[PDB]
Amino acid sequence: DVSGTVCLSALPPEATDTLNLIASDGPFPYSQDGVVFQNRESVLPTQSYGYYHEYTVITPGARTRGTRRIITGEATQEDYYTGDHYATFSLIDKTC
């Protein structure tokens, strides 16, 4: 399931950074940025492998990549945020 919608302004500022980098094809901070998201628990709508790509949203103070990600879908109209490494997602509204 997708847990409603979230304004980009309501996300950490690092989420804006991630979206800017997604649009410019990098530079990405982590080697895994851009990898296909498998959606292996079917939390997001079912799509063929390659539909979804994942990108780290840097967590300040973290040692690892932390649990924040943006998952992109079709074109630039279907970006999801997860704060909990894929347990839940919300559709991002980049206009607010």
Query: Side by side, which strands form the sheet with 5-7?
Result: 5-7, 90-93, 79-82, 69-72, 53-56
Look up 53 and say whether it is catalytic: no
Q: Which of 41, 54, 74, 78 is catalytic?
A: 54
CATH class, domain 1-96, is alpha beta
Look up 74 and say whether it is catalytic: no
Sign of the four-CA dihedral 86, 91, 95, 96: negative
Which among 19, 28, 3, 5 is positioned nearest to 96, based on CA atoms? Answer: 5
Measured distance CA(41)–CA(4) in Å, rounded: 18
User: In the PDB record, what is the listed experimental method?
Assistant: X-ray
Q: What resolution, expressed in A, was reported for this entry?
A: 1.2
| Region of residue 22 (phi > 0: left; psi between -120 and 50: alpha; otherwise: beta) | alpha
Contact by Cβ (8 Å): 9, 81:
no
Measured distance CA(59)–CA(4) in Å, rounded: 22
Strand partners, 69: 56, 82
Contact by Cβ (8 Å): 82, 88:
yes
